[PDB]
Amino acid sequence: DDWRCARSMHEFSAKDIDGHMVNLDKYRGFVCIVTNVASQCGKTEVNYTQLVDLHARYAECGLRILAFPCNQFGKQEPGSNEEIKEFAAGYNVKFDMFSKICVNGDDAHPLWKWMKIQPKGKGILGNAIKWNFTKFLIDKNGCVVKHYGPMEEPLVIEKDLPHYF
């Protein structure tokens, strides 16, 4: 069953930033923000601080956040998985960091390929992530229900969370 016929985020797996495989069904029944992150982006500060703050206030409601380092946007994630992990702790990050992946191209991680063709019939424009700090919102069934681009500060998502909690 190739990634194209997948029906949920819960059918995918990903290496977390320490190196352990994570079956993403671990997030069944939670509301997730899946984002591709970077450490040297003009939008680094605003995304990391607001992502942390959303998780602080909404973790107790079911919000989980999956952060995927990716170096495909102006080489703004050049560091190792270990440097990236320490950087993220400088933001007091308590959500779930994953190892660096690609989000575009034929070598993109299968989850990010499948997210870019959601919801069925539309999918993201040009089949490509446009820059760092794209944010997908995943409902408690692992479906993509909304997408927020690199321009959108994460706190823009706050108003939409309660529809899915």
Side-chain angles (χ1 to χ4, degrees), residues 99-119:
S99 291
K100 202 197 299 208
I101 63 152
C102 285
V103 301
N104 289 336
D106 197 19
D107 295 316
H109 181 290
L111 170 74
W112 278 78
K113 290 185 175 190
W114 171 88
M115 282 191 307
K116 292 181 300 175
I117 63 163
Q118 312 291 319

Side-chain angles (χ1 to χ4, degrees), residues 30-119 121-164:
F30 293 94
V31 170
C32 303
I33 292 163
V34 182
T35 187
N36 64 307
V37 309
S39 286
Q40 308 160 15
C41 181
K43 303 180 218 282
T44 278
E45 198 49 71
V46 62
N47 274 272
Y48 266 96
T49 54
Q50 304 189 180
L51 283 176
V52 166
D53 179 62
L54 276 170
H55 188 226
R57 292 181 299 130
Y58 291 106
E60 74 170 345
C61 300
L63 180 59
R64 293 301 178 273
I65 304 185
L66 297 83
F68 284 91
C70 176
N71 192 37
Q72 293 189 283
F73 303 108
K75 293 173 79 190
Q76 277 158 23
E77 192 69 289
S80 77
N81 284 317
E82 288 324 87
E83 313 177 285
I84 293 159
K85 187 171 169 283
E86 211 43 54
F87 185 75
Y91 284 107
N92 308 99
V93 162
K94 296 177 161 197
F95 49 86
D96 293 330
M97 303 296 302
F98 289 81
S99 291
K100 202 197 299 208
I101 63 152
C102 285
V103 301
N104 289 336
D106 197 19
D107 295 316
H109 181 290
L111 170 74
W112 278 78
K113 290 185 175 190
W114 171 88
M115 282 191 307
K116 292 181 300 175
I117 63 163
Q118 312 291 319
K122 233 291 195 192
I124 197 185
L125 250 152
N127 196 18
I129 308 319
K130 299 321 206 287
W131 201 248
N132 306 306
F133 290 118
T134 278
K135 287 147 293 243
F136 292 93
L137 189 79
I138 310 303
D139 74 352
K140 304 181 300 182
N141 302 118
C143 330
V144 181
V145 291
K146 284 197 76 160
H147 157 65
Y148 311 81
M151 306 337 153
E152 274 146 87
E153 301 103 304
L155 278 178
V156 160
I157 298 126
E158 189 174 7
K159 59 228 202 51
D160 294 326
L161 300 175
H163 315 55
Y164 306 105

